[PDB]
Amino acid sequence: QPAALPLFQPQLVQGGRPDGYWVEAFPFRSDSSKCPNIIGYGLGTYDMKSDIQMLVNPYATTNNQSSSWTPVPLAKLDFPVAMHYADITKNGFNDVIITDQYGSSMDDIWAYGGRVSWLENPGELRDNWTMRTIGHSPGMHRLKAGHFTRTDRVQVVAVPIVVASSDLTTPADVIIFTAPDDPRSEQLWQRDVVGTRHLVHEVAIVPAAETDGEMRFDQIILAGRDGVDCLWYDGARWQRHLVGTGLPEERGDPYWGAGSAAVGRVGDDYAGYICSAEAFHGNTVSVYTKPAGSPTGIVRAEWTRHVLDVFGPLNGKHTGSIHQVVCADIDGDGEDEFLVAMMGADPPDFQRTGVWCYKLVDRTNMKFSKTKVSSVSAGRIATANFHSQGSEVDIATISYSVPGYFESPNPSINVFLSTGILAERLDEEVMLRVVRAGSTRFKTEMEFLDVAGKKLTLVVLPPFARLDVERNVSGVKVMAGTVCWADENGKHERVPATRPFGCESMIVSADYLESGEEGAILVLYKPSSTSGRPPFRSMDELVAHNLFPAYVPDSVRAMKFPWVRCADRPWAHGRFKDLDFFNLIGFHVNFADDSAAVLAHVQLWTAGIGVSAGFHNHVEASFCEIHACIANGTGRGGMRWATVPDANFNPDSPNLEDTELIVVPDMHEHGPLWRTRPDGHPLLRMNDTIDYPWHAWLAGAGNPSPQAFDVWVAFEFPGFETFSTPPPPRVLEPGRYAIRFGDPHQTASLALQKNDATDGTPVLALLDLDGGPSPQAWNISHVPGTDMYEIAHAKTGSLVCARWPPVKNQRVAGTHSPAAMGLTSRWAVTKNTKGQITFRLPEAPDHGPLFLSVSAIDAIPVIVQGDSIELSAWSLVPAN
Amino acid sequence: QPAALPLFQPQLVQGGRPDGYWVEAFPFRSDSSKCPNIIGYGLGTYDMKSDIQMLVNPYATTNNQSSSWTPVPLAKLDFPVAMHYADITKNGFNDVIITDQYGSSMDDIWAYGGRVSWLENPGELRDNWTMRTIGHSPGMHRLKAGHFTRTDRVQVVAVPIVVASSDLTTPADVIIFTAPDDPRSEQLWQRDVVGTRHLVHEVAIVPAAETDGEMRFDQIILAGRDGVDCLWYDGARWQRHLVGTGLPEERGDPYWGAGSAAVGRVGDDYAGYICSAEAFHGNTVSVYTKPAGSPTGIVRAEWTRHVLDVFGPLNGKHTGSIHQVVCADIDGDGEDEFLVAMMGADPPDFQRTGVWCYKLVDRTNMKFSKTKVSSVSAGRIATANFHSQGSEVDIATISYSVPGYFESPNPSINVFLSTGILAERLDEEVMLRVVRAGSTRFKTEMEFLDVAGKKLTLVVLPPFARLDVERNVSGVKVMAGTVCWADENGKHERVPATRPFGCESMIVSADYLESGEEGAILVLYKPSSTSGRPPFRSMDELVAHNLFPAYVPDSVRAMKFPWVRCADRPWAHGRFKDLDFFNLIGFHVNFADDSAAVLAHVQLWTAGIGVSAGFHNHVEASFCEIHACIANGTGRGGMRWATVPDANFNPDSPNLEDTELIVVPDMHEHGPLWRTRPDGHPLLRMNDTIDYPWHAWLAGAGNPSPQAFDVWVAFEFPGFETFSTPPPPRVLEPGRYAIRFGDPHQTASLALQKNDATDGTPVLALLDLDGGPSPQAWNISHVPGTDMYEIAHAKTGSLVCARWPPVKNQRVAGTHSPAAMGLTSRWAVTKNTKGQITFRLPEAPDHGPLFLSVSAIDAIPVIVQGDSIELSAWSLVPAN
Numbered sequence A, B: 001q002p003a004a005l006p007l008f009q010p011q012l013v014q015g016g017r018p019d020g021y022w023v024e025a026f027p028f029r030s031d032s033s034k035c036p037n038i039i040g041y042g043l044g045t046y047d048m049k050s051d052i053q054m055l056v057n058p059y060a061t062t063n064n065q066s067s068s069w070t071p072v073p074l075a076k077l078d079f080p081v082a083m084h085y086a087d088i089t090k091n092g093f094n095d096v097i098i099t100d101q102y103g104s105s106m107d108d109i110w111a112y113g114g115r116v117s118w119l120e121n122p123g124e125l126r127d128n129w130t131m132r133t134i135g136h137s138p139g140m141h142r143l144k145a146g147h148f149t150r151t152d153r154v155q156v157v158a159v160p161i162v163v164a165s166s167d168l169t170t171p172a173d174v175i176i177f178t179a180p181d182d183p184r185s186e187q188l189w190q191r192d193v194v195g196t197r198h199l200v201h202e203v204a205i206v207p208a209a210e211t212d213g214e215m216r217f218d219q220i221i222l223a224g225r226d227g228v229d230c231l232w233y234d235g236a237r238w239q240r241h242l243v244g245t246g247l248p249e250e251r252g253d254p255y256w257g258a259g260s261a262a263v264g265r266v267g268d269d270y271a272g273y274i275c276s277a278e279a280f281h282g283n284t285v286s287v288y289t290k291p292a293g294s295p296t297g298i299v300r301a302e303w304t305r306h307v308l309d310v311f312g313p314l315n316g317k318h319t320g321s322i323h324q325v326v327c328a329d330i331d332g333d334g335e336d337e338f339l340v341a342m343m344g345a346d347p348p349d350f351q352r353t354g355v356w357c358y359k360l361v362d363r364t365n366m367k368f369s370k371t372k373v374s375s376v377s378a379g380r381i382a383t384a385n386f387h388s389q390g391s392e393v394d395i396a397t398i399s400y401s402v403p404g405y406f407e408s409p410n411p412s413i414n415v416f417l418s419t420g421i422l423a424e425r426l427d428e429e430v431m432l433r434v435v436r437a438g439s440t441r442f443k444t445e446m447e448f449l450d451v452a453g454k455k456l457t458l459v460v461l462p463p464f465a466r467l468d469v470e471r472n473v474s475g476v477k478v479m480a481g482t483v484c485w486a487d488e489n490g491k492h493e494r495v496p497a498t499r500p501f502g503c504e505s506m507i508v509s510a511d512y513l514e515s516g517e518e519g520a521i522l523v524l525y526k527p528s529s530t531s532g533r534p535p536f537r538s539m540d541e542l543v544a545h546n547l548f549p550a551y552v553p554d555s556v557r558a559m560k561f562p563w564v565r566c567a568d569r570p571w572a573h574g575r576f577k578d579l580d581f582f583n584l585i586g587f588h589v590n591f592a593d594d595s596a597a598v599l600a601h602v603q604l605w606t607a608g609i610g611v612s613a614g615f616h617n618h619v620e621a622s623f624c625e626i627h628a629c630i631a632n633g634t635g636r637g638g639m640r641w642a643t644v645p646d647a648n649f650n651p652d653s654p655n656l657e658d659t660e661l662i663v664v665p666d667m668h669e670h671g672p673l674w675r676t677r678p679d680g681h682p683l684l685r686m687n688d689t690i691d692y693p694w695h696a697w698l699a700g701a702g703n704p705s706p707q708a709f710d711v712w713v714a715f716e717f718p719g720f721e722t723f724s725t726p727p728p729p730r731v732l733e734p735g736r737y738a739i740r741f742g743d744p745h746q747t748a749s750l751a752l753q754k755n756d757a758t759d760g761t762p763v764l765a766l767l768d769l770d771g772g773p774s775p776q777a778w779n780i781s782h783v784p785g786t787d788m789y790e791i792a793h794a795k796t797g798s799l800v801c802a803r804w805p806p807v808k809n810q811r812v813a814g815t816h817s818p819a820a821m822g823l824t825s826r827w828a829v830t831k832n833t834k835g836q837i838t839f840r841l842p843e844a845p846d847h848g849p850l851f852l853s854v855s856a857i858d859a860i861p862v863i864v865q866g867d868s869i870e871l872s873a874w875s876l877v878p879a880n
């Protein structure tokens, strides 16, 4: 399933900065690289030195309460430009390498400038690290650290853009610096010039480790006027591989070739593609591709350049808006997207301000599409997981601001935090916007409420994702998809709602669980010691606490969730006076996509001993409701429903003996209580409300003291199809099959007319001409929380589905536009004593059972009919 | 109807400031006071002077494209503290009055300091205004400008907090300064000391104009150690009126009394209440009240102090978190809420960080409740309409940050913009979160899309609100509530959906329209010249443009809305190939409240000549859909629906003669097309989908060139009850009535048992004992877009409603918890040739017509029955 972009909670790392040029992700220790810091700064001015401020990552430490990024001044430098880092001292701390003394601009280059230097990490978070000089070369513009001719030392490649003021035509030395055995002695680093290039504006590095053995040394990618270029060493010699020339020169315009270039991973190949921005500070985005079946990596292939976008014209000084391109697996599917850092433009224009995120949509043809991620100036981009231990990629940017050239307003640093859940305050209640679990490749955990001895945590899971829980203590309640675990009694599974009137324990009994093909969205009930211990004798004992992560907006963090006694709620209207009966609100969960559709509404309730939460039937508003009890004060509290008809039951003086009880014990959820058609569509009232019998929560009877409160969580789902009444036997495993009709000799198979993907393509029985048309393949699968199945074309995906309306003799077709709740594309299965299978639609109350059937005994068309048992028997051969 | 709080779009006015203390709303001109600027600053330090930066309001000019607040340095001052403004030069520009030279703290008071000075407004937006000295007094802490002993000159009241370092016990002069005839000559201002007070920490002013003639001069309110105090002049003498003492002193604690105080308007009274914060920088909120029926204003009443909140303990230097209280009609109901500026606390704590907004909930008892508006440090608050011409009140804050005392992170200025609509990007589509029109007191306009020669503008209206439109050009489509206009043919009205299969012009033919009792939420189609002119020959001609206001978030502002050809849409699946048939998405409108409920989903469509948007029936997803056509390319395009049953119609090769057509001309909307029960509940399919016959948009037939596109807007509503089939006659005006049964002598009336507000109170016929029980009153009103009515108790509000379920002989009760779509609380009316009225429920298909009826011929109970015509006749007398 194509990977979806994740969501992005923005957060302001540093604001109102004087200026801004550079931002980098800085892992303090060089061993590990999760939750790094950010280092950022600007080019400074003649009046004021630039503070290279290292901002501390607050999420760097778990148990985090801060969102604030603490600024540590690493140093104070005359026009710094570029930087990188590596463990120079070989002590497991990262040391900063930085160039400075550039000049104020390319027409103000410092003759004795372009200094390259390293800042020694002292192992703690004091400011002002001892600085040392690596070396000088006028115009010094970019550098990277790695192992280029030797592995047993830190080496630095450094490259001036020009050598002197306004001189755009003299090329610069590509320089390599080498650590001594003892970098702590103030002395000059060994240097080599390894080529001369014109107007190099970016250096990119491909570590030896990423090349899956191809290269023992680090590869240098240079984006310049000469274009995009690859230099590498092999042990004996330097060689060069031209990737391309980039922008063709125009007359009068000193800039051509490239300003930035990055190497994209695709699958097993670390160089699936090289992306590029042209020229120096240009407006042109392009990508170099190589022919299908090329060798892995850069140098063994010939590269061709295709232009993707030109974001509009250049100004009189022949510049534009693109400062950088970088590569990163944003959506976490194993292919690298690339991000374009937009400086902003003049006049102002959002098309040219922010980050564009390009996604490789078609691997064969190398087609891309761009989405907008952020629309506030990006002078530089840095990527890294900035908030968790998993492999999400967050995006940090610094605003591009240089006085006397181009200034954006409120020059700042913000980071955009990858997440599959977002939290927004409405008023008293909260909005949890969620990704479709189906198409994320990321696990997301967000704690929200600490109540009744439990930490309520909203959790999204990618397909086939594992959640490591606490055996027998942890509990779950699935809201979308399915989860699964196994102990001594085999496999167990949890779906949005169990069997009508059933009861299921929420306690995971294994050390971990796993999500279904469709992933899962769930509430994990974690054990908490900060919210009391049952039994609960008072509401003061059940105070709940606001648990949202430091990185959620403040208005959400500042919210309290009091328990309000139902009698006092605005919707009470004189009702529930004198009842220890309380209610806590509340948490909307809705999909973050363009449907904005509801997943569930959640709120909470408590009942003292002898208390009835009142009988009702939900005529006021439409929902399929499932309760999960957390604490059962008496061991005997649960749900009652009336067995007599609605007319026959007085809700006010309720006769409990026209009622049946389901104890919902500690950490259990119960099955649906609403009325349902035989195959599990709900009954509907005249005002479009899920039809329910009279029902209520009743707490255990007896002495109100000592007190002992029931605590339960309401789950208000929109309509769906549940299980069948009565439950069919299980006569079919899902799997890929051929679906066939007939006997020993004369047989035919179910088929999608000319294998055609279009909605409304006919479905047929194709005679098995022993000439060799070959029987088509069908994927059959169970629908979770039902007793129904669907049949989907192995090849197109098309669902076997009766055309509208499902009556005696309707034609059958393939569709990707099924009706709500699978009304015409889900089937009840039987199996005769022969072994034949039958497929039936949700029975409507007028038309009888209608089966998937042939119509005779060239292609026979397919229909649903009720009349003949013979036409509807099918033999299932396993296919592939 | 109680007024709801409006919504707040936050916006960052200035960030990453060094420090922060003061913020003020500064009207550049002194004539007008809409869209003022903001002036703000901090106390500065010994190293750096404080820039009193005046930030330009970008919304100050209409046709605004900027959100950025341009900083103008007004001056650069040694420890400024407080400020105000007034037109000193009498030239219609506001001049700034400011104190500075305070000292660094109360233990570092400047002996020759406390300077008071004015900055001359030069009539333009250059920086650095000529400064002049008004006068000095050590410790100078607060001041206000007004007319206190004379009207023909600007006067300034100024008050030191202390007179010298750490001296907390010597009180200070309350000083009055007077402009000369010629303030432009550098000379000293005339001064008077008008009293001495202890630790005055706030000055508040009550202009002569607000006192409705009571006071010819301005009233001075002082919050200090002596408490909250009122000094005023009358022409001859000063007098003083003690409002209260405030915090009672504790031993060892130099602070008591008050730190801030503000005067709240209530209705016709400008001093309904005085609110207060205690003590100096304290944690205590209280309010002074006066006895019901007191005279208006402050000095003619005796004031009593009630404590509302104590936000937690004090630190060792006996301080807390509250810096200021102010008053403002936030919700616009004619009563002033008050806001508390929270500095933040230590350790950090949101309860003490931000603004609390208190609302006077009960005028009689003077009860308040607080809501949280913002949760980022507020050192000072300023209120003013910062973005429109109406009377919404926005909230600006500056962070409280003083180094070496208390520092919050990212000291900045933000403003919170009052609005009833909020705009949030989802992905390709937009979320428009809206207030309930019913309970706002503000008109809100937000343009979103410029398309087909129209500016599509979302509009919320308070009840009985007027929208001034362009006669015959402007158009409207109501999504909630009702609008109304009148021309020569009388009154016209527009509701969410007109009569099934009808057609209504959207063109307002008057110069204005007005909203209904329930207000309205609508799309106003404004005339645009930036989006082309019909007829539309190409899609390039119908490019639409993103119109959201500069104050909406950036991601929303940066969005494009392309027209995508339906064939290429993801949901297309081989369908609509080769059809000039396009689609633009999209705009969710949802209520901003805790229900988060849908109002409508909106998207757009176009069809070339001879094009059918395809036949369908909405089995895929549930909605009540209404289309509004903007441009009809042929004059003949519209909606077709099948008249044969669903089985009888082949959607693929559609036989147009089993179809009927409704031309939806230019600027018209049509009536519902879905199937409906006789009183207008929709028919529902087995999968809970609004049941529709086969239907489609078909463009006019004939020559595809010249081209000519239909352009229409889809409105996807959730289920509701529409009009009745067939339409009943109008036999009843709404109004207040007594509802009576019988004949000449023996009569009884409909009544709510013991006038009791509780849900499920019985409804009865009370014998009219001529002793004098007196007949109860009932409000009867039409339900918009239906042909039904409801009966609501004049006194409680309780709806006359049959208990569940509505069958032969059901009991009738009063409720505020009605069922969805009024299923049991809405009535079809008849009137016999006598004049008697009958009330019938939405007829269910089993039980017959059930009428509101008595049950005999002490109180007779009330029921719904079908059997007897006699028991159900009612006589309606007008009541009051």
Ligand SMILES: O=C1CO[C@H](CO)[C@@H](O)[C@@H]1O
Pocket (backbone or CB within 6 Å): A479, A480, A481, A496, A597, A598, A599
């Ligand atoms: O579109 C949908 C399909 O399945 C989900 C649950 O698993 C629904 O809640 C959602 O609205």
Ligand SMILES: O=C1CO[C@H](CO)[C@@H](O)[C@@H]1O
Pocket (backbone or CB within 6 Å): A605, A613, A614, A616, A625, A696, A697, A714
């Ligand atoms: O079933 C339920 C739904 O709403 C009821 C309100 O009285 C609750 O008591 C209970 O959670």
Ligand SMILES: O=C1CO[C@H](CO)[C@@H](O)[C@@H]1O
Pocket (backbone or CB within 6 Å): B479, B480, B481, B496, B597, B598, B599
């Ligand atoms: O609660 C509601 C009542 O009326 C509105 C329209 O006027 C609805 O759309 C809304 O969902």
Ligand SMILES: O=C1CO[C@H](CO)[C@@H](O)[C@@H]1O
Pocket (backbone or CB within 6 Å): B605, B613, B614, B616, B625, B696, B697, B714
């Ligand atoms: O009635 C409608 C709803 O969806 C259809 C999609 O083909 C549109 O053509 C038309 O706006």
Ligand SMILES: [Mg+2]
Pocket (backbone or CB within 6 Å): A086, A087, A088, A089, A090, A091, A092, A093, A094, A095, A121
């Ligand atoms: Mg090191």
Ligand SMILES: [Mg+2]
Pocket (backbone or CB within 6 Å): B086, B087, B088, B089, B090, B091, B092, B093, B094, B095, B121
């Ligand atoms: Mg003036």
Ligand SMILES: [Zn+2]
Pocket (backbone or CB within 6 Å): A003, A328, A329, A330, A331, A332, A333, A334, A335, A336, A337
């Ligand atoms: Zn990816």
Ligand SMILES: [Zn+2]
Pocket (backbone or CB within 6 Å): B003, B328, B329, B330, B331, B332, B333, B334, B335, B336, B337
């Ligand atoms: Zn108000």
